[PDB]
Amino acid sequence: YHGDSVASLGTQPDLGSALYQENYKQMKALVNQLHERVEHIKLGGGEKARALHISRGKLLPRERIDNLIDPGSPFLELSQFAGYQLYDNEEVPGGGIITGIGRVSGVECMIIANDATVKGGAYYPVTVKKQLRAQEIAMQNRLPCIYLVDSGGAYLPRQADVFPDRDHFGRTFYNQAIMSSKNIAQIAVVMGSCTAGGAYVPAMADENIIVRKQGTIFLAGPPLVKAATGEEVSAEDLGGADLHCRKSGVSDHWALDDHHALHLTRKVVRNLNYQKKLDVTIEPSEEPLFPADELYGIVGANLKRSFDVREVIARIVDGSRFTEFKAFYGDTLVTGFARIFGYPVGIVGNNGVLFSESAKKGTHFVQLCCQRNIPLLFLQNITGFMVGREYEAEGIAKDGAKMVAAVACAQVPKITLIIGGSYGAGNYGMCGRAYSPRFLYIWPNARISVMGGEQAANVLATITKDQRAREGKQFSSADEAALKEPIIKKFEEEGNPYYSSARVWDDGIIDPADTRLVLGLSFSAALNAPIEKTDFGIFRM
Amino acid sequence: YHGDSVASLGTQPDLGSALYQENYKQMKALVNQLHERVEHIKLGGGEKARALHISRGKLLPRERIDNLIDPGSPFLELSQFAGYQLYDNEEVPGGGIITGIGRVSGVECMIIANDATVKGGAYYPVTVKKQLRAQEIAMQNRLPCIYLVDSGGAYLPRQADVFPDRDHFGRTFYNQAIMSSKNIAQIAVVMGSCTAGGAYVPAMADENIIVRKQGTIFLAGPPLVKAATGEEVSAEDLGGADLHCRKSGVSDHWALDDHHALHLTRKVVRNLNYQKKLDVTIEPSEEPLFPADELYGIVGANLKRSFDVREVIARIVDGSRFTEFKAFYGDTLVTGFARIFGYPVGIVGNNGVLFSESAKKGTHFVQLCCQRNIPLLFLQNITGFMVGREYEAEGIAKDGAKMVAAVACAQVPKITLIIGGSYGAGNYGMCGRAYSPRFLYIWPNARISVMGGEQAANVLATITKDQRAREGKQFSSADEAALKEPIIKKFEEEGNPYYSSARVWDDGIIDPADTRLVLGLSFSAALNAPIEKTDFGIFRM
Amino acid sequence: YHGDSVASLGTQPDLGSALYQENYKQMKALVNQLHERVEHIKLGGGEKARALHISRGKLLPRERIDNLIDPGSPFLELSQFAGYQLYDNEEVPGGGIITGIGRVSGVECMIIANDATVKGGAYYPVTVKKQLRAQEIAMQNRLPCIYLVDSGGAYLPRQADVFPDRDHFGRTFYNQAIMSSKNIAQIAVVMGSCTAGGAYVPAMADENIIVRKQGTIFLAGPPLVKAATGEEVSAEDLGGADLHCRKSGVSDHWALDDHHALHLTRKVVRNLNYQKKLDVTIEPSEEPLFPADELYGIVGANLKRSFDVREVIARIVDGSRFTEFKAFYGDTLVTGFARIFGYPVGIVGNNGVLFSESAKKGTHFVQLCCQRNIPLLFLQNITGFMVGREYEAEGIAKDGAKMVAAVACAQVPKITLIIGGSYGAGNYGMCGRAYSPRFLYIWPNARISVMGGEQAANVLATITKDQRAREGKQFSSADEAALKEPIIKKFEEEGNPYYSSARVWDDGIIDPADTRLVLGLSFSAALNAPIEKTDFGIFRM
Amino acid sequence: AKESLCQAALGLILKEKAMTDTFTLQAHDQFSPFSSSSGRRLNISYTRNMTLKDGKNNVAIAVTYNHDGSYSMQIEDKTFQVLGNLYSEGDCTYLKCSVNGVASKAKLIILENTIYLFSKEGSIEIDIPVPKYLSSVSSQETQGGPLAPMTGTIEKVFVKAGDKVKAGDSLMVMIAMKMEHTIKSPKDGTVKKVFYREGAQANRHTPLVEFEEE
Numbered sequence A, B, C: 001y002h003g004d005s006v007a008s009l010g011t012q013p014d015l016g017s018a019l020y021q022e023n024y025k026q027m028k029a030l031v032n033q034l035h036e037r038v039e040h041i042k043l044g045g046g047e048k049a050r051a052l053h054i055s056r057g058k059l060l061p062r063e064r065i066d067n068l069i070d071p072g073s074p075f076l077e078l079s080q081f082a083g084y085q086l087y088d089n090e091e092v093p094g095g096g097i098i099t100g101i102g103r104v105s106g107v108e109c110m111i112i113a114n115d116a117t118v119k120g121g122a123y124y125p126v127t128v129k130k131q132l133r134a135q136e137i138a139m140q141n142r143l144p145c146i147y148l149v150d151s152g153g154a155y156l157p158r159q160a161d162v163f164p165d166r167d168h169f170g171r172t173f174y175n176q177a178i179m180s181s182k183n184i185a186q187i188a189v190v191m192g193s194c195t196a197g198g199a200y201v202p203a204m205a206d207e208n209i210i211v212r213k214q215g216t217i218f219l220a221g222p223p224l225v226k227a228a229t230g231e232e233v234s235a236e237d238l239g240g241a242d243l244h245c246r247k248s249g250v251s252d253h254w255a256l257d258d259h260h261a262l263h264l265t266r267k268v269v270r271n272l273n274y275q276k277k278l279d280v281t282i283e284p285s286e287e288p289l290f291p292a293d294e295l296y297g298i299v300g301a302n303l304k305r306s307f308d309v310r311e312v313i314a315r316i317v318d319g320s321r322f323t324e325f326k327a328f329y330g331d332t333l334v335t336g337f338a339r340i341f342g343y344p345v346g347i348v349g350n351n352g353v354l355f356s357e358s359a360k361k362g363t364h365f366v367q368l369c370c371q372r373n374i375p376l377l378f379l380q381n382i383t384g385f386m387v388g389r390e391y392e393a394e395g396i397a398k399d400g401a402k403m404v405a406a407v408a409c410a411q412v413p414k415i416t417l418i419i420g421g422s423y424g425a426g427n428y429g430m431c432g433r434a435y436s437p438r439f440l441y442i443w444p445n446a447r448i449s450v451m452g453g454e455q456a457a458n459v460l461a462t463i464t465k466d467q468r469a470r471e472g473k474q475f476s477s478a479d480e481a482a483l484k485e486p487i488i489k490k491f492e493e494e495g496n497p498y499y500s501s502a503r504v505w506d507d508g509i510i511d512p513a514d515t516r517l518v519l520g521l522s523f524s525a526a527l528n529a530p531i532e533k534t535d536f537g538i539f540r541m
Numbered sequence D: 001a002k003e004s005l006c007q008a009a010l011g012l013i014l015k016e017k018a019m020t021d022t023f024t025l026q027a028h029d030q031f032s033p034f035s036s037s038s039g040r041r042l043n044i045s046y047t048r049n050m051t052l053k054d055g056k057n058n059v060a061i062a063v064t065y066n067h068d069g070s071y072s073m074q075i076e077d078k079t080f081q082v083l084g085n086l087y088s089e090g091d092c093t094y095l096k097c098s099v100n101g102v103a104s105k106a107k108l109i110i111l112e113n114t115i116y117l118f119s120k121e122g123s124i125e126i127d128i129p130v131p132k133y134l135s136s137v138s139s140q141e142t143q144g145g146p147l148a149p150m151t152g153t154i155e156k157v158f159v160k161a162g163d164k165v166k167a168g169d170s171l172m173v174m175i176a177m178k179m180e181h182t183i184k185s186p187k188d189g190t191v192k193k194v195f196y197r198e199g200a201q202a203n204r205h206t207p208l209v210e211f212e213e214e
């Protein structure tokens, strides 16, 4: 029996209001700017590299991915803004690698492809970080992965950042071994020459496909062999699809053109013999009752103005149906249950500065969801944190610890979205990047940093004032603005969404309009991994 | 392949036979008497309490239950005859509490509601016993439970029977904690003031709903606080839906009227995210080939006459299809396989005085059913037991022990019905109340006691005769009837179905006509708990 | 490394203080009174029954127990005050049964023996309750049990309280089957005739021993057979050690005199092939630094005066060494770690009226001990409970619920001792009888009831005053003392230690001097059961 | 009229039974007696009472789930013996029922809050109640008066001591310590008076503007 009608969230924002107009204009400006940049990134290494790559007869990586996936299906690229102005003068579109999740032969699987157009497929440090992030996502979600190797090797001028360290290059192979150990499939496809970077990968993978001419599997390149052993020989003699197939046996299959390799890959995936099963109650799904684009006028591009979360929730969940939990108590925070694309979810969001009561409410909600095996989604807009003499007297920090412990010990899949400004230890509290959320995204407006620039400028001013007063020449009235200005500027630069997305702190920058769609895709993939028991540490009263 | 036709049980009783007429008249008299009494019980505390309860705006408990369940669904009240003339002069309809099982939002769940009309919702000792019985049923069947608290507190004049002992009051909280520990849900709804009895219950439960005005959650009542601490204040300041919601956080939701609380409860149950799964083969079900009411003429209201069990079985099972097991051997007992409402069952019934062979047959049958994971149903009419010098020489008691061991160690769900007179240790043998059957019911005619009155009178006469003869003044010829009469009378009084049902030795008194329907409901609920391995102790040869 | 010296608890009470003299005199009076009563109980049924029991050649039950146990070993009788003035006019020493725990052949095991001297070994309702309590103790502690049957059967004049109900007679057999199912041993020894009560027990047990003449195993007695079947025959033909041994096989062994049966029992226990293993760190043990008898002067016999718990703890734990946990916060309650007889324990005790902070401290302590697998001991002196408008505003009831949940979900062995007055819901909070503690004892001074008599008198006065004022004739100034007096008297009678110990709400009344010794014995037995994981329900913030 | 009210009240149960039936079909166990729409209690005849809007007048219908499947409803001391069923011609479903021995067939189109009976002789309009808590009027009754979530300086108040109140209008703008938030009018009633003047500060959960009772 499901005949009871339920109240729906959200209202109709006043379009005629000048505030809505202003917010809309700001959000359009940001979205347009993002779109133009993404176009320029997708062009890749540049026209000349494309001309040469075509001249060899290979297919450009974007074309390869389009042919590989089940046609007419969505594909979810990740961290497209990697390496955006990260290095001093070297243009590295997309980090010289394309990674994503797609549906192939009816089974979700992660695709990782080199981009030989960009810098000959050399592994920049960011490239390794991006690839490892993809692999860990696949393992947690328990998804098969496919590699499309056209890489040369590690970037020589930066060897310290690539080779030695634990999380550095080579950890890739370790993950590969662990994946194959616990039945997660591995497939490697070779389209280009490889020198010790794409040489172990086919040997490391269970299955192997190599194109007849353009594919060569060799541990040491012809220049490396010539320089090291004093002997020169073409990589085909060390590599080659036919040469390796007849005698070496490294290649399990022998393809002629790029299309043939893709088709064979589809056949292998079908033969993989895996079936997905769910363990959560499912229901029919319906669209939210309100248009999504209104969010622009609701949110704007200023962190100062405040927007109620429930408006956004109405714009997202199925049918705009929501059941708030302990609404009156701890109003600064919002929790409740909802359904997205027929899947149950628990929504946690921020309205204002946290207090002790909000922390207690969040802890109780987390326990409930973990007990009932319900996925969790976080919408954090932490304009301020819990600071105050009365607050610390009653151990508001202790309540914050309760947030941290509950979030950390949780085992159900967790997804986080940074709708608004994130600062302070609340990032740790509301399932930050460090707390291993399955995904993480940021809207084009959000700014993330440890503290607002003004706060740090004031704090530094005071500490210098106190110590220099102890030194006899206190921080003078002059230099106050001179000292403050650089701190504000630097914090602004480090808080920019592109700046963080240049590194891999986030999985991607998404416009608000696409939000709903992305979430559904993510949750579907996350459901592949079976749910497990959640065990909690000591709950300090 | 299921095309083989099967022989069907039962025949057509001769309606014209004077015996059938007489039996029918007796059974009608009993059923009519039961119906009138149940009407009077359902009126509740009386007109004046109903008028006051309405005056406060609350809804009467029966109305609340009707609104709460999925409408147009059966509901199975239990032990309605609790407290029937149990106390000296205090009328306690229904034990001042209504408990039952119902289907809410498509999920079975147990409803327990106080009746503030009856004696202000005080907990009489029987009330605690009834409630605890309901809770243990829910835990064994693994069902969510919902409380509708409108209770004041324990009955002061009887505090010894309520507070201290292990199975006494307070064990309720222990069960609540265990239930919530192993994921069985708990929901508490508050409609009336509570003083330390309904105060821990909302705190003990995971979810909480309280009506705006009529609901007040407070550990100590205004008179208790005034008498104890010398300070007086209204219970609203200690309780109150708004007061507790804004600050205390005891109330997870805030409802306005009684209907709103019920509707919110439905929403929570839907969000609970549980799915029922079966582990037994199921088949289409069809009605029995014979009318049920014929049982009246078959059975009558005299324990002396005998009726073959197979007649009743034909009146019950689906399609009146039955497959007797080892029919010729141990004819005094009947076992076999059948299907009820598409579920497989194993029927065990009594025809006469047990013997050694019957015990062996029953033990073998129990082992088979336990091995194949088939539920068991018992129909005991133990007019006599196994007593005799030749019987005890071959250890007929030992065979009875085999019955006891097999029944006790069994793990599949078991249901028992007392169709006829139950006496002696056979009650222990055929899954008595002590042996933890999931349910137990009695027909209006059955009489249960340790021994028939005549037997005890004779035994007491002999022992007094022997000892007094040793004393020199033997039990004279006089006083024999004078001594016998009180024993017969007392055993008759203690054997009455209402007398036993006044206590909680049985789950309810049901007319034969409804029998089939009730069984189906019970078995469906019992299937929620997953079946487990059955381990047997030492089988003394 | 264990060279650090530790501060020791306790001081030297001022003996010369008149208060110490007064307290000492009171405690002596109580202890003397208890000792005299226990003497009178141990005499048993009376001289004449002893003379007859000797005349048959049997050994008196006390003699049997002394011979059976490993000689020169302590034995721990339980609930000796059962049936103390419980019935109207029937003297039932020791409930007509002797139960206890002892060390036999190096293995702890529970001994249960009938007392045929007292009322022919009939099962009074209290007798069944006592026996079942013993069996549940054995199963939780996972101990072998031995029965010494000399019983006739259930008490006929009270059949309602014995036969039918779930926890009534016959549940014994169910426990026996479960015990034998999970490898817990069962041994039955027969010294006297048995009629359907001690008839199934030998058949139900794995091993069996019966004396040649005085032992007869028969399901139905000669008077029962004669009255029922119309056939008379001596119980020896139905029973008899030789008769059953040659043909029936019910008796696995055949003994001549009582001593022979005891000796054979020792042999069987040795052959049982069980070895005890511990799973907790153990250390050398030393006596407490102070004499135990000082407790008398410390405690006295008045509930009004207060004594610090740490004095008692110093009188108990090994070396009077203690490490208080969070001492300054929540001072009204005391927690810490200590060692008794080389075993680690966690002590929880009460000093005064509970508050919210104390509840939080207790919850945190419970979590720690459960995590580290440390047994728990409770010393409750609840003079008052948590009641107050400000207290209930901050949900002091909610914190009490945290106490209840933590205690209930705990899985480590728990022992409770009622040093002082116990009242209110705190009994539930500090591991009351209902919460299944492995043991429970009360000092001769303690009084237990739901509420103090004065409180209930005041509350009843107010409610009658209010309702009668609504009736137009309020509770007058007269009758106030007339109404109060009976309530005070009745609560005093129900709170007496003997009154509660007459029933089986407690395991025994022990003088303070013996306290330490008893605890050690209990904990040693409790260590037989392997420790298990502790799982906690929802921790309502 | 009176029979027509009964006919609609039957229709609600039949639609509800069918929707009760549908969820059973997708479920694992479609065979339990619980799925039956009998609404039968143990030893008691279950009765549920309705209220249906009939033009101006609300009418209370008492439905007793009879033992045999017949349907008994009573309105102003007139009882009615009703048995009916639902069958669909084409895509539209007809309601066929007999009331006190008189039977007829009618289209049964059921909206969100209105009941449609279509027949050759005429049509009947019946309205289902809407719960007040579901009507969002209860939502405005949750809070007696406006409360300031956080302490802060009131810049300026948009409403005077006596001023008309419109829906969505802001009471005042209150900015405090790295936060500005705009307080709205809780209810459309004309303000009795404004509690706080310009530049004042009100604590958490404190009244801001007094409003007349609606």
Ligand SMILES: CC(=O)SCCNC(=O)CCNC(=O)[C@H](O)C(C)(C)COP(=O)(O)OP(=O)(O)OC[C@H]1O[C@@H](n2cnc3c(N)ncnc32)[C@H](O)[C@@H]1OP(=O)(O)O
Residues within 6 Å of the ligand: A116, A118, A119, A120, A121, A122, A150, A151, A152, A153, A154, A155, A156, A157, A192, A193, A194, A195, A196, A197, A221, A224
């Ligand atoms: C693991 C090791 O340290 S072994 C590394 C040494 N081996 C190599 O990588 C050899 C160079 N790479 C190759 O030739 C690969 O086999 C190929 C075929 C995939 C690359 O194909 P090509 O594009 O023809 O190679 P090419 O040398 O033209 O690469 C283009 C650019 O990438 C750079 N590059 C490619 N691989 C590397 C590398 N491993 N380290 C540093 N730079 C590299 C080159 O400097 C070159 O400069 P440019 O981008 O400014 O023109």
Ligand SMILES: CC(=O)SCCNC(=O)CCNC(=O)[C@H](O)C(C)(C)COP(=O)(O)OP(=O)(O)OC[C@H]1O[C@@H](n2cnc3c(N)ncnc32)[C@H](O)[C@@H]1OP(=O)(O)O
Residues within 6 Å of the ligand: B116, B117, B118, B119, B120, B121, B122, B151, B152, B153, B154, B155, B156, B157, B193, B194, B195, B196, B197, B221, B223, B224, C450, C459, C463
């Ligand atoms: C757990 C404890 O022992 S502490 C409990 C002490 N506090 C109380 O319960 C005070 C009594 N409470 C009450 O008066 C009521 O139960 C209320 C106020 C909660 C609401 O109950 P109502 O339905 O309004 O009943 P009302 O107040 O009219 O009358 C109380 C009746 O309930 C009975 N009752 C209810 N609770 C108790 C109790 N704890 N002890 C004794 N009798 C009680 C009384 O006998 C009385 O009987 P009556 O029907 O002959 O008058």
Ligand SMILES: CC(=O)SCCNC(=O)CCNC(=O)[C@H](O)C(C)(C)COP(=O)(O)OP(=O)(O)OC[C@H]1O[C@@H](n2cnc3c(N)ncnc32)[C@H](O)[C@@H]1OP(=O)(O)O
Residues within 6 Å of the ligand: B450, B463, C116, C117, C118, C119, C120, C121, C122, C151, C152, C153, C154, C155, C156, C157, C193, C194, C195, C196, C197, C221, C223, C224
């Ligand atoms: C399980 C059942 O309901 S079947 C029970 C019926 N069977 C019986 O036990 C009948 C009674 N049998 C007896 O007389 C004895 O129990 C015997 C013969 C087995 C042994 O008892 P003894 O220790 O020799 O006592 P004795 O026979 O001298 O006297 C019997 C006494 O025990 C009491 N008694 C023993 N069993 C029972 C019983 N089942 N019901 C009632 N009273 C009993 C009698 O009241 C009598 O009381 P007394 O102590 O004031 O004299």
Ligand SMILES: O=CCCCC[C@@H]1SC[C@@H]2NC(=O)N[C@@H]21
Residues within 6 Å of the ligand: B353, B383, B384, B385, B386, B387, B424, B452, B454, B455, C227, C228, C229
């Ligand atoms: O004459 C009446 C005495 C009742 C006899 C009861 C019979 S005898 C054999 C069987 N065993 C019992 O316990 N009851 C029946």
Ligand SMILES: O=CCCCC[C@@H]1SC[C@@H]2NC(=O)N[C@@H]21
Residues within 6 Å of the ligand: B227, B228, B229, C353, C383, C384, C385, C386, C387, C424, C454, C455
């Ligand atoms: O004057 C005598 C009344 C007894 C007071 C008992 C105190 S009051 C606060 C505390 N709570 C209780 O239940 N008892 C104590």
